[PDB]
Paper text:
Archaeal Type IV pilins and archaellins, which form the subunits of pili and archaella, respectively, are expressed as preproteins with a signal peptide. The pilins/archaellins are then assembled into a filament, wherein the hydrophobic alpha helical N-termini are helically stacked in the core of the filament, and the hydrophilic β-strand-rich heads are oriented towards the filament's periphery. Through single particle cryo-electron microscopy (cryoEM) and helical reconstruction, we solved the structures of these filaments at 2.61 and 2.52 Å resolution for [name] and O. meridianum, respectively. Atomic model building, bioinformatics analysis, and motility experiments suggest that the [name] fibre is a nonrotary, likely adhesive T4P, whereas the O. meridianum filament is an archaellum.
We will henceforth name the filament of [name] pilus (CdiP), and, by applying the same nomenclature system as for the genes of the homologous S. acidocaldarius, we will refer to its subunit pilin as CdiPB. The protein is 135 residues long and folds into an N-terminal α-helical tail, followed by a globular head. The FlaFind server, determined a class-III peptidase cleavage site between residues 11 and 12, indicating that the first 11 residues are proteolytically removed during the maturation of the protein, as is typical for Type-IV pilins The head domain is composed of six β-strands that fold into two β-sheets but unusually also contains three short α-helices (α2, α3, and α4). In addition, CdiPB contains a comparatively long linker region of 12 amino acids between the head and the tail of the protein (G38 to A50). When building the atomic model for CdiPB, we identified two N-linked glycans for each subunit, originating from conserved NXS/T sequons (N64 and N106). The densities for the two glycosylation sites were well resolved, allowing the assignment of six and five sugars for N64 and N106, respectively. In each of its three component helices, AapB adopts a unique conformation, distinguished by the angle between the head and the tail domain, as well as the structure of the hinge. Such a three-conformer architecture is not evident in the CdiP pilus. In contrast to the twitching Aap of S. acidocladarius, the CdiP does not have the distinct three-conformer structure that has been proposed to aid the collapse of the Aap into the membrane during twitching motility, and indeed, we were unable to detect twitching motility in [name]. It follows that the long hinge may have evolved to provide the CdiP filament with particularly high degrees of flexibility, which may aid surface adhesion, cell–cell contacts, and biofilm formation. The cells mainly adhered to the surface of the substrate but did not display twitching motility.
Residue numbers in the entry:
A (entry chain D), B (entry chain A), C (entry chain C), D (entry chain B): 12 to 146
The structure:
Amino acid sequence: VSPIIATILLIAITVVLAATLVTILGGFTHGVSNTVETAGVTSHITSKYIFINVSSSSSAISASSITITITGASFKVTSGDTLAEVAGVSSTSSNATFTGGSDYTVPISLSSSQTVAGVSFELIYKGNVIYNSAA
Amino acid sequence: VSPIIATILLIAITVVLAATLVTILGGFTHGVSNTVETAGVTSHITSKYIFINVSSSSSAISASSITITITGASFKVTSGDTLAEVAGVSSTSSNATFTGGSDYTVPISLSSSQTVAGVSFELIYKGNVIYNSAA
Amino acid sequence: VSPIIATILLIAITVVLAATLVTILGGFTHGVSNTVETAGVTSHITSKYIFINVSSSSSAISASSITITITGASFKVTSGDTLAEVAGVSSTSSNATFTGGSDYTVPISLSSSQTVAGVSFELIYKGNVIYNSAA
Amino acid sequence: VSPIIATILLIAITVVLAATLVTILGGFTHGVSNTVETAGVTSHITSKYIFINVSSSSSAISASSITITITGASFKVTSGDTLAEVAGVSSTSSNATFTGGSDYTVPISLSSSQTVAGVSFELIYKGNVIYNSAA
Ligand SMILES: *[C@@H]1O[C@H](CO)[C@H](O)[C@H](O[C@@H]2O[C@H](CO)[C@@H](O[C@@H]3O[C@H](CS(=O)(=O)O)[C@H](O)[C@H](O[C@H]4O[C@H](CO[C@H]5O[C@H](CO)[C@@H](O)[C@H](O)[C@@H]5O)[C@@H](O)[C@H](O[C@H]5O[C@H](CO)[C@@H](O)[C@H](O)[C@@H]5O)[C@@H]4O)[C@H]3O[C@@H]3O[C@H]([C@H](O)CO)[C@H](O)[C@H](O)[C@H]3O)[C@H](O)[C@H]2O)[C@H]1O
Ligand SMILES: *[C@@H]1O[C@H](CO)[C@H](O)[C@H](O[C@@H]2O[C@H](CO)[C@@H](O[C@@H]3O[C@H](CS(=O)(=O)O)[C@H](O)[C@H](O[C@H]4O[C@H](CO[C@H]5O[C@H](CO)[C@@H](O)[C@H](O)[C@@H]5O)[C@@H](O)[C@H](O[C@H]5O[C@H](CO)[C@@H](O)[C@H](O)[C@@H]5O)[C@@H]4O)[C@H]3O[C@@H]3O[C@H]([C@H](O)CO)[C@H](O)[C@H](O)[C@H]3O)[C@H](O)[C@H]2O)[C@H]1O
Ligand SMILES: *[C@@H]1O[C@H](CO)[C@H](O)[C@H](O[C@@H]2O[C@H](CO)[C@@H](O[C@@H]3O[C@H](CS(=O)(=O)O)[C@H](O)[C@H](O[C@H]4O[C@H](CO[C@H]5O[C@H](CO)[C@@H](O)[C@H](O)[C@@H]5O)[C@@H](O)[C@H](O[C@H]5O[C@H](CO)[C@@H](O)[C@H](O)[C@@H]5O)[C@@H]4O)[C@H]3O[C@@H]3O[C@H]([C@H](O)CO)[C@H](O)[C@H](O)[C@H]3O)[C@H](O)[C@H]2O)[C@H]1O
Ligand SMILES: *[C@@H]1O[C@H](CO)[C@H](O)[C@H](O[C@@H]2O[C@H](CO)[C@@H](O[C@@H]3O[C@H](CS(=O)(=O)O)[C@H](O)[C@H](O[C@H]4O[C@H](CO[C@H]5O[C@H](CO)[C@@H](O)[C@H](O)[C@@H]5O)[C@@H](O)[C@H](O[C@H]5O[C@H](CO)[C@@H](O)[C@H](O)[C@@H]5O)[C@@H]4O)[C@H]3O[C@@H]3O[C@H]([C@H](O)CO)[C@H](O)[C@H](O)[C@H]3O)[C@H](O)[C@H]2O)[C@H]1O
């Protein structure tokens, strides 16, 4: 009798270990994707505007998917921080897509202590910095 | 009579062995998880401040989850040693999340014998070193 | 008596499981081989002929092992689709081996609607495309 | 009586099988180690001498741990075949360690039929070839 019953108990234990292992593996098999992007970007800064002109990019991406951050100044548009939003890009505009041939104008404001030589900005896509004016 | 009674005793013993084995296995089936993280980090050190600028990361993580340690100097903030805490990160601040585009300034103090060339620091997340200024 | 007999039955069952497992593994341990090839190839297309000139290759291979496919035109030789066959390569010919210094001429025919600008072709070896005129 | 006695016999058999298995495993769990080495080496050969100049190495190793073999010629030193030995390296010599900046001169002899164009040699460390003059 007993060697067969002991075998049935060990099969029952084996299934629970396998089910446990499957939940451990689930912590590895997610959140990996191709996030690399690369663009030819040029820029000019003034007391009122930042100009951004794109010459080429690795892929064509929406101007709403790009986040812009700034230091030494402030945006004149206050709703948020996507490139499409601060640049005033309408959905019909040519500049709705970030690719070679797209140009943007961002309006900015300086305090009494701030100066043009102190201003810099960065463009971020999928958590990677794709441009930095102070490089 | 006796061969059946001996069989009943062996079943009773078998259950206690199986119950014992289950408690042995419990020492293996815990504390395994995916703790790997990887970031593009750059840094500059001065007699008053450490600057830390992040360009990309493997995942988006809270600045309170990262621990910072220092040698050759001391922090001007004394409450603890999380990155959010020593850098003075408010909960509304852009720099509340550690990702590309996040920048931090940490204020520090040197003794009469300490010098800038002697200072170094490390960032630790889930018990792994993710950055070391002296690498 | 019975604990020994139960043990003999469990050995008999164990052998059949092991024999079963061996037949499962046989579905993995076949059909893996090094099929990569790479060649410097140049080509010119006309209303009557395709010219193919080889400058180098990763290995020396038989012209009968290479398959050619065409669109926008048709071959003047109708027996099949190996490179040796459609190019009229005799077994004594220098061009029997695909390597640097081997040249081939393939004769072709166009319909009333087909034109030279529409023609393209590919070379295939061991199920991989090694050249494509429209790349 | 008998089901308990049969159980005691099966425990005695189980221990001998486990002890047998332990001796099988001992044939796998030995003789695995990191034996890889890699060096920038340059060499020049003449009718009387081989010159060997080292520019870099993966690790710093003793010149007595390296074995040299030769064809088309013979060594003027006859005691053995370690690099330190045939090159006449004293224990105080700079060239006692194989690293960037170490240079060696090995004296050789040719027969009436042998010629400089026929000579070649190899350096061997832990059973791997680390340099071969005829590569
Ligand atoms: C992506 O693609 C899109 C689409 O192609 C854009 O090209 C985007 O780049 C943006 O382009 C816009 C348009 O040029 C830029 O916005 C302008 O900034 C200029 C200053 S500039 O020096 O001339 O170059 C102007 O301020 C312009 O606005 C005009 O409108 C102002 C407000 O007028 C509005 O309201 C009145 C009622 O009060 C209405 O009657 C009127 O119809 C209009 O709706 C005027 O004040 C302004 O006059 C003066 O402006 C400046 C001083 O600020 C001065 O320098 C000028 O010489 C001029 O004398 C001018 O007439 C801005 O355009 C937007 O206009 C809207 C308005 O709602 C109409 O849509 C807003 O009200 C803002 O005024 C402004 O956003 C933008 O900066 C670029 O990013 C590409 O990136
Ligand atoms: C993450 O994101 C967050 C949010 O964006 C941060 O950006 C963080 O980086 C931190 O930024 C802060 C803010 O800049 C840094 O803190 C400052 O260090 C500077 C020195 S610096 O050379 O100017 O760059 C200043 O010390 C600044 O403080 C100011 O406040 C001091 C104290 O004033 C306070 O108390 C008085 C009453 O005594 C109040 O009236 C006043 O309103 C204020 O509450 C001033 O002494 C100081 O003057 C002088 O300071 C230095 C000398 O130390 C000198 O170099 C300057 O030129 C100036 O003459 C200045 O006015 C610091 O900011 C914090 O201020 C708080 C205060 O409670 C207000 O919140 C503290 O009291 C500390 O003073 C200080 O923490 C910080 O180092 C960065 O980590 C990103 O990582
Ligand atoms: C790999 O290596 C091999 C070996 O080196 C090859 O080099 C291969 O490349 C191939 O080369 C051959 C040989 O050049 C190419 O085939 C020829 O195409 C030309 C046209 S071209 O403009 O001159 O360049 C010719 O058509 C040539 O054929 C000749 O033969 C024709 C038929 O004659 C045969 O039959 C008669 C009986 O009717 C016999 O008397 C005769 O001896 C022969 O057996 C002739 O019609 C032809 O005359 C005219 O041809 C063309 C018009 O089509 C015209 O442009 C010419 O100016 C000329 O006036 C010419 O005399 C082709 O060669 C092959 O010949 C065989 C024949 O059986 C002998 O072997 C076939 O009958 C075909 O005619 C033809 O396949 C080939 O295209 C290349 O792939 C390398 O890749
Ligand atoms: C690692 O690091 C070590 C330490 O730095 C070495 O540098 C090693 O490289 C070796 O260097 C040695 C030293 O240079 C090389 O050995 C020499 O080969 C030269 C030939 S060469 O063309 O000049 O370059 C010499 O043969 C030299 O020997 C001299 O000694 C000979 C023997 O003299 C000995 O015995 C007499 C008694 O008979 C004593 O009086 C004397 O003091 C000495 O002990 C001489 O014959 C020789 O004269 C002529 O030699 C050659 C012809 O063979 C000729 O070309 C010359 O122009 C010269 O006229 C010369 O004076 C070799 O050095 C070693 O000397 C020992 C001796 O015991 C002293 O230690 C041996 O007897 C051998 O003679 C010889 O091994 C070696 O080849 C390099 O590997 C780095 O790899």
